[PDB]
Amino acid sequence: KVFGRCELAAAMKRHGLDNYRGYSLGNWVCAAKFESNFNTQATNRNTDGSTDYGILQINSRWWCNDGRTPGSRNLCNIPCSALLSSDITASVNCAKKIVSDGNGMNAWVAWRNRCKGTDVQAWIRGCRL
């Protein structure tokens, strides 16, 4: 599923991301825009052989099992395919774990490079929330 901006903001709000570890909802919607273009089906291979999955591009090195990333962990205890669902529950629940790990939203390269320090409230402007 390719979300609209506000549709994703509502879905993220309802699943408890708004202000989660102190990151306002705009930061999550901004991260999703630049990680996946709001596409739950997005996948991208990394050089190390891991793959990033879903609307928030969660990596199989640490967070999910894809059966082809040797010596990786699955800290979210999910198949990576779960992160591609049109239902973002798995993605959000795994994102909560990531963001809690110590490095905050710096775990998302696109957030650090394109969202951090920017006017992220722009991403939820006009939305009914």
Residues that bind Cl ion (CB under 5 A): 4, 6-7, 11, 24-26, 51, 60, 65-66, 68-69, 79, 87-88, 104, 120-121
d(CA 61, CA 81): 14
d(CA 30, CA 111): 7
Residue ranges binding Na ion (CB under 5 A): 60, 65, 69, 72, 74
The set of residues, in sequence order, having a beta carbon less than 8 Å from that of 127 and lying 6+ positions away, is 5, 6, 9, 10
Out of 7, 18, 48, 52, pick the active-site residue: 52
Asked if 35 is an active-site residue, the reply is: yes
Asked if 48 is an active-site residue, the reply is: no
What residues are labeled active site? 35, 52
Q: Which residues are annotated as a binding site for substrate?
A: 101
